[PDB]
Structures are given as C-alpha cells and as structure tokens.
Design a protein around this ligand. Structure first.
Ligand code: ADP
Lengths: 54, 53, 53, 53, 54, 51, 53, 54, 54, 53
C-alpha cells in the first residue's frame, strides 16, 4: 500500500502544480472555446437529422 | 477535465481574488464611507442654505 | 412519425445546451473584468501601502 | 507653479458654485447637490494648495 | 485528471498566444475585404438561380 | 478576428488619460440645458422691445 | 413554383448578409477613428504629461 | 527586501540615465511634429464618419 | 542560532549599503514612475469593467 | 525632527476628533468609535515623542 500512497503524493503534487499553472484569464476563455468547438459538432448532427426528416 | 468543472474552478478562484482584495483593503486602512458620509451631509445642508438665499 | 418524435427530443436538449454555453460565455467576460479589476486593486494597495519595504 | 495651481483650482470652484446655483434655479435639488460636492471637492483641494504655498 | 487538466491549460495558453500575436484591427479590416468578396460571389450565384427561374 | 476585440484594444488605451468621465459627463448634462435656456429667454424679451 | 420560392428565400438571405456587412463597415470605421483618437490623446499625455525628455 | 529595494534603486538609476541622455528640446519639438501628424490622421478618420453620417 | 545571527549581520550590512546607494533625486522620481506604471494598469481594468457594464 | 513629527501627530489627532463630531451627529456610532480610538493612539504616540524630545 506504500506504493499506492507514494503514487497518491506524486499525483497530488503534480495536480496542485498544474492548478497553480492555470491562468484564469487564459483558461476561462479557453474553456469557452472548448464549449463552442463541441457545440459546432452537435449542430452538424442536428443538421443531418433535420435534413433526413425532410 | 470538462469545461464546466474548469469554469467552476476558475470562477471560485476569481471570487476568492475579489474577496482577498476586499480583506486586504480593510486591513490596510479602508476609509471610504467615512469621507463619503461627510460629503453627503455637507452637500445637503449647503444646498438647503443655497436655495434659502 | 418515429423520425419526427425523435428529432424533436434532440432539439430540446440542443436548446438547453445553447442556453448553457451562452451563460458561460457572458460570465466569462464579466469574470475576466472582475478579475482584472481585483488584481489591479491588490497591486495598487501593495504599492500605496507604507508597511514593509 | 504652486501659485498657478492654487488660482486655477479657486477659479474652477467658482464656476462649479455658479453651475450649482444655475442648476438649482432651473430645478432639481439632487443635480445641485452633485454640483456642490464637486464645488466642495475643489474648494478643499484649493485650501490644501494655499497652505502649501 | 492530471493530463486532462494539462490539456485544458495548454489549449488556453495556446489560444492566448494567438490572441496576443493577433492584430485585431487587421482582422476586422481583412474581414470586411473578404466579406465584400463573398457578397459578390453570392450575387453571381444568385444571378444563376434568377436566370434559371426566368 | 473579432471586431469586439479590436474595440477593446482601443478601448483601454482610450483609458489612461482618464475616462471615468466625472467631468465631461457631469459638465455636459446640466451645462447645455441650463445655459441655452436662461440665455435665449432673458435676451429675447429685451431684443424684441428695441426692435 | 419550387424555383420561385427558392429564389425568393435566397434573395432574402442575400439582403440580410449585405445589411450585416453594411453594419460592419459602419462599425469598423468608427473604431478606426476612435483608435486614432486614443493614440493622439496618448501622445499629448506623453509630451504634456510629467517630467522626462 | 534587499532585492526589492535593489530593484527600486536600479529602475530609478536607469530612468535617470535616460533623463540625462534625453534632450528635452528635441523631445518637445519632435512631439509637436508627431502630434500634428496624429491630428491629420484623426481628421481623415473623422472625414470617414462624416461620409457615413451623410 | 549562530548561523541565523550571521545571516542577519550579512543582510543588515547589505541593506545599509543599498540604503546608502539610494539617490533621492533619482529614486524619489523613480518611485513616482512606478506609481504611474501601476495606475495605468488599474485604469485598463476599470476601462473593461465600464465597457462590460454598457 | 522630533518636534516636527510630534507637531504633525497633534494636528492629525484633531482631524480624527473633529471627524468624530460629524459621525456622532449622523448616527455613525462604530465609525465614531474607531475615530476616537485613532485619536487615542495618536495621543499615546505624541506623548512618547515629547518625552523623547
Ligand atoms: N516624473 C514623471 N512624472 C509624470 N510622468 C512621468 C514622469 N517620468 C516619466 N513619466 C511618464 O509619464 C507617464 C505618466 O503616467 P500617467 O498615468 O499618464 O500619469 P497620471 O497617472 O497622472 O495620468 C508615465 O507613463 C511615464 O512613462
């Protein structure tokens, strides 16, 4: 279990480090980009479905 | 990993920054209201006197 | 009939997701504004502060 | 330069006094109050400069 | 989670670098130039549907 | 690409030389109204008498 | 009838597009003017600001 | 504190070196030349908002 | 604790030296520069906030 | 210099004290208390300086 504990410490440190590395100004914006990127693809599917219905 | 979770995370961080700044001011010496309260009461009585004459 | 029933279900969920994404987009801007304002206030408080060298 | 600054602030204070009163005659006490706050603000600043001079 | 967060942080950083490099005034200007061109292309295509209609 | 971003970039620089506008803002509002009002009124009665 | 109604709708999309482009041209130009104004203000704030060469 | 003070001392020293090197008469003159140019640029841009208004 | 005392002496000497190295004429001026530099950035934030409000 | 510091502190103490009159009139009880407490601390400081002088 000491191996698992060691892993948990390693991951916790790295998770804290990447949390620190976040820049809200950049990141918040980037998150929105991802939302849009994803939506566009949903819209393409809804586009096909609507066309098929017709 | 999702956008919404990341957002909630950044949002809390931002709110915490607003809170940090607010607290930092109070500890620093936050007057504001003091000055504001006097200028409000002054303009009041002065306008009354101004209007009276 | 099957196509019409199912393509309408998909529209309810797209509409909900659209409300959701736009929510985040508007909040994204104001949050960035709030964050910059707060960040700056903290910077001024440090500079104006007489405590410490 | 200090002499110049003092006079300039004194003059602006007189213009704001005039404006408060013109606004007051025309109507609106709240508008006159706003003008007065600025009048006082400039008067206070002028006093400070006088002492400095 | 570690890499998942890393990916989000990285895309935002990349987008920010783009935003930084990005002259917005040329983008907007350049855009008007392309939009005008597209308008013209649509006018020709429309002219063909009108010819066919006639 | 954003027109909005183009506006912001400009919008800030506009900001530095003071743009909270406690002066221009305040000034103009009661200024234009009050001045023209009292002016033309008083003036006009006097003018017509001499004409 | 199919061609006529198709063409009419297509014509409407064309008008909408053009209107938006017209709007964008109007917006573009005022932003350019404002940008030049900002720059000009900055130069006067530099030369006629504080101390330095 | 040591380096924090060093930084302040250093920037002031650097600015002073600039101030020293700085001919103020050319700055002021050069400035008028640029301000006049900017005035002209604003006039053209304004001319465009007038054209649009018309 | 002798190590900490040694450090304190070293730092005190260096702090006195950089205090001596201050040139009020340069430094006082530089300090004002920093104030302005900092303000400009606050103004940019207030600029955004005001725009968002509108 | 001792005299200069102290003289100053005595002026600042009055500014808090005469501020307290306005706060008390308004009904700003806590602000009035803090103003009085600030006046005390300056009075304590001023005393320490005299001795020093
Ligand atoms: N001694 C000085 N006083 C004022 N401005 C200076 C001085 N030295 C250099 N400057 C330049 O002038 C500008 C003054 O900052 P600014 O924020 O425009 O002034 P203010 O805060 O009074 O509006 C700075 O960007 C700086 O580069």
């Amino acid at each position: 279990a000491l191996f698992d504990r060691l892993g948990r410490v390693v991951r916790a440190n790295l998770n804290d480090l990447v949390s620190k590395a976040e820049d809200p100004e950049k990141v918040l914006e980037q998150a929105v980009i991802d939302m849009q990127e994803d939506l566009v693809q949903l819209r393409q599917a809804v586009a096909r479905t609507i066309a098929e219905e017709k | 990993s999702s956008a919404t979770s990341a957002f909630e995370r950044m949002e809390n961080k931002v709110l915490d920054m607003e809170a940090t700044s607010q607290a930092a001011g109070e500890l620093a010496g936050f007057g504001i209201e003091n000055q504001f309260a006097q200028l409000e009461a002054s303009s009041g009585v002065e306008d009354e006197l101004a209007a009276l004459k | 009939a099957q196509q019409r029933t199912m393509s309408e279900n998909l529209r309810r969920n797209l509409a909900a997701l659209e409300a959701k994404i736009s929510e985040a987009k508007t909040k994204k801007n104001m949050l960035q504004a709030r964050a910059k304002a707060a960040k700056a206030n903290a910077e001024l408080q440090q500079t104006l502060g007489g405590l410490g060298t | 330069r200090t002499e110049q600054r003092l006079n300039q602030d004194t003059q602006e204070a007189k213009k704001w006094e005039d404006r408060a009163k013109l606004a007051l005659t025309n109507g609106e006490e709240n508008l006159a109050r706003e003008a007065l706050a600025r009048k006082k603000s400039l008067t206070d600043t002028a006093a400070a400069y006088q002492t400095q001079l």
